[PDB]
Amino acid sequence: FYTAPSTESKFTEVLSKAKLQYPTSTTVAFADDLLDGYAASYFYLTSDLYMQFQVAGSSQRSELREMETSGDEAAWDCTGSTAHVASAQIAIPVQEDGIEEVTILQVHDSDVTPVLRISWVSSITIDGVTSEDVVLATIRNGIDDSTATKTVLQAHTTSRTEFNINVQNSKLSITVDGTTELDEADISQFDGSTCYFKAGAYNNNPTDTSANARIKMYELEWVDHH
Numbered sequence: 226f227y228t229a230p231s232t233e234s235k236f237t238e239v240l241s242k243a244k245l246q247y248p249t250s251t252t253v254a255f256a257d258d259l260l261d262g263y264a265a266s267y268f269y270l271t272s273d274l275y276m277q278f279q280v281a282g283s284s285q286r287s288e289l290r291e292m293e294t295s296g297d298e299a300a301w302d303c304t305g306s307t308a309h310v311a312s313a314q315i316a317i318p319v320q321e322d323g324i325e326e327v328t329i330l331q332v333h334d335s336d337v338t339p340v341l342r343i344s345w346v347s348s349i350t351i352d353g354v355t356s357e358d359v360v361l362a363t364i365r366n367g368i369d370d371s372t373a374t375k376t377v378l379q380a381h382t383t384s385r386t387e388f389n390i391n392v393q394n395s396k397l398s399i400t401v402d403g404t405t406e407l408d409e410a411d412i413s414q415f416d417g418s419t420c421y422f423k424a425g426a427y428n429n430n431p432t433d434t435s436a437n438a439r440i441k442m443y444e445l446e447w448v449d450h451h
């Protein structure tokens with residue numbers, strides 16, 4: 226008794242260009258499955274037309290992974306001259322107790338390293354400044370460097386918020402409601418890697434492994450250019 230996101234034409238294209246992973250890396254639904262009305266407690270359309278992702282547990286996810294319409298996985302040159310752009314209108318609800326960080330958008334390499342995570346965090350300390358209840362950008366410093374550069378993007382609101390990720394020419398930019406919040410961050414450390422976008426709910430370091438993270442997307446698209 227869950228309504229499928231495929232019933233809304235605003236999602237047809239991105240679902241054609243995605244596969245759904247849940248609760249870890251295994252695909253539960255490919256593009257054709259998604260287009261054919263795939264729906265579950267962790268992936269469904271709300272009555273006000275949000276695509277909602279929900280998942281409990283440490284490092285568990287309900288997440289769309291960028292695909293080509295051919296069925297090939299997206300694997301674009303992370304630092305190439307072609308622009309790759311992800312856009313999403315996301316409402317981040319107040320998270321359940323014990324949910325401490327939820328990753329909502331990513332640029333991931335074709336191996337084991339997230340180039341970029343955009344996440345909600347309960348608390349973060351960056352160079353001696355603690356922020357509470359914010360949306361954060363985390364860019365990994367390298368494949369062999371587990372550390373990352375972190376940038377607060379936005380004070381958390383439940384209001385629908387426009388996020389835009391633009392990747393081109395070894396630089397990455399993020400806009401939030403039209404305002405640039407990360408301006409041409411360097412990602413040259415992923416020269417020679419291939420990349421793709423992800424979107425959904427990825428539950429990072431919960432303190433209650435039974436609590437549900439929950440993220441809602443009113444619009445989602447990923448594109449190439451030139």
Ligand SMILES: O=C(O)[C@H]1O[C@@H](O[C@H]2[C@H](O)[C@H](O)[C@@H](O)O[C@@H]2C(=O)O)[C@@H](O)[C@@H](O)[C@@H]1O
Pocket residue numbers: 284339342363365371372373429430
């Ligand atoms: O030591 C850390 O906790 C390390 O985590 C990093 O984010 C990771 C996420 O929590 C997820 O596990 C997944 O997405 O992998 C990420 C990663 O290893 O890059 C960063 O937040 C990093 O700053 C932090 O030290």
